[PDB]
Amino acid sequence: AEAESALEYAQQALEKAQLALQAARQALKA
Amino acid sequence: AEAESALEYAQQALEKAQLALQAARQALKA
Amino acid sequence: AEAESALEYAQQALEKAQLALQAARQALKA
Amino acid sequence: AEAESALEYAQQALEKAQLALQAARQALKA
Numbered sequence: 001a002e003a004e005s006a007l008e009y010a011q012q013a014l015e016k017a018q019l020a021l022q023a024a025r026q027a028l029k030a
Numbered sequence: 031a032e033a034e035s036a037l038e039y040a041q042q043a044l045e046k047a048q049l050a051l052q053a054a055r056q057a058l059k060a
Numbered sequence: 061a062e063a064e065s066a067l068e069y070a071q072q073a074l075e076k077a078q079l080a081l082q083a084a085r086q087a088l089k090a
Numbered sequence: 091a092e093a094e095s096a097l098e099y100a101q102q103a104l105e106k107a108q109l110a111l112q113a114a115r116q117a118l119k120a
């Protein structure tokens with residue numbers, strides 16, 4: 001269970017991260 | 031500026047993604 | 061400029077991290 | 091096996107990504 005719960009959480013974290021990137025990518029235009 | 035906060039946010043999210051993933055790989059060997 | 065290439069590189073790496081992770085979560089339910 | 095091989099690869103990708111971030115973070119100083 002915990003294994004499948006970490007992979008779910010880690011996916012969450014990864015999707016949170018990709019938000020941050022695209023925002024940062026847009027800012028790089030500025 | 032925002033790209034700052036976006037990049038810092040992203041790095042954190044990956045660490046949470048990393049440490050969780052490490053628990054997961056551990057469960058597999060169990 | 062380099063931050064450009066660094067950000068683009070990072071976004072790609074996360075996608076490879078994402079799609080692999082999706083295969084992994086799938087194996088768990090098996 | 092494949093499950094434990096994806097998590098290994100996804101960890102690789104995550105570590106590749108974190109290189110890209112820190113480089114990008116330093117560039118943000120400029």
Ligand SMILES: c12c3c4c5c1c1c6c7c2c2c8c3c3c9c4c4c%10c5c5c1c1c6c6c%11c7c2c2c7c8c3c3c8c9c4c4c9c%10c5c5c1c1c6c6c%11c2c2c7c3c3c8c4c4c9c5c1c1c6c2c3c41
Nearest residue numbers: 016019020021023024031032033034035036037038039040
């Ligand atoms: C905006 C910036 C700020 C605003 C913009 C909003 C969105 C997005 C950007 C942007 C980055 C900014 C700034 C920064 C603030 C600020 C605000 C603003 C809101 C907005 C939301 C989104 C949205 C993303 C966007 C990124 C992007 C990052 C950028 C950073 C910081 C930083 C920080 C603040 C803060 C707030 C907060 C809001 C929240 C929204 C979301 C998400 C998330 C996106 C991320 C994240 C980055 C990150 C943080 C925090 C933080 C969080 C939080 C909210 C979250 C959330 C997310 C992230 C958080 C965090």
Ligand SMILES: c12c3c4c5c1c1c6c7c2c2c8c3c3c9c4c4c%10c5c5c1c1c6c6c%11c7c2c2c7c8c3c3c8c9c4c4c9c%10c5c5c1c1c6c6c%11c2c2c7c3c3c8c4c4c9c5c1c1c6c2c3c41
Nearest residue numbers: 061062063064065066067068069070106109110111113114
């Ligand atoms: C440097 C930039 C460029 C040089 C600097 C070198 C290192 C780092 C940065 C930096 C980013 C740059 C540029 C860009 C080139 C360029 C070069 C330079 C070399 C260097 C290595 C590292 C190092 C990281 C560093 C980041 C950082 C990103 C930045 C981007 C691009 C981009 C691109 C080139 C290219 C080459 C190549 C070299 C290689 C090294 C490593 C790693 C990796 C780091 C990453 C990655 C980012 C990314 C890409 C590619 C790519 C790759 C590759 C090499 C790899 C590798 C990595 C990444 C690749 C990729």
